[PDB]
Amino acid sequence: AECSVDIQGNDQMQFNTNAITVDKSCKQFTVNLSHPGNLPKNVMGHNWVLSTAADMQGVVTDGMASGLDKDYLKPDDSRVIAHTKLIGSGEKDSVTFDVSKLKEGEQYMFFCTFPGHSALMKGTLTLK
Amino acid sequence: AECSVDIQGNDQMQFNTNAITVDKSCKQFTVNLSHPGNLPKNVMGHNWVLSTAADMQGVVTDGMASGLDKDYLKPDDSRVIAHTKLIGSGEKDSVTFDVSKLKEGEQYMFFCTFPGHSALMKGTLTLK
């Protein structure tokens, strides 16, 4: 912990946390995502994407349209604050981002953009 | 209609109906399944599988273990009353089964066995 969090996406399309707090003293913050299940990336791939709560739906919709090869994210989507790659069973990936890109008193959501998964795989992130 | 129903499973991992009623006047019943989305079968394939409610979990778990080559269904699973093939985008399939294989007073469930889909892709079938 301290400026990092570990999250897992499983074969039941669930993240193992639904809320992340980012300490305002952290200059940067790292998310370490792993996949503890046994299903492959094409069937049950997961990623972790951060946007404002207001931008989440447009990022999910355009992520689906980008497809498979683009890790279901529109390239250079300006609304994505940070995101991982899409990972399969047994993989891991991290993203570190600057905490100065987050405002106090704004609502953020993290979610997975694999088709259909965001209904279940989503949570809030807040500065503290 | 009445002795047949048209169902579709889309890219949002949902069926367009979650309850089917089979009139006891029907000697046979036909299910026509289509996939109106753009995702491929190995990423978002769908099938329509019928069993008793009590047998659904076992069918889904064993189905998952059989893999894509088996259309995610255990070969000659006696718990499956009827099923289609697994189809991808723009495909369709149809299956007809005998209504006397259903009895009144028993709870039946139709569902998709592609990994993870049955959490949302399921519904009741009732003989009325």
Ligand SMILES: [Cu+2]
């Ligand atoms: Cu996911």
Ligand SMILES: [Cu+2]
């Ligand atoms: Cu399905």
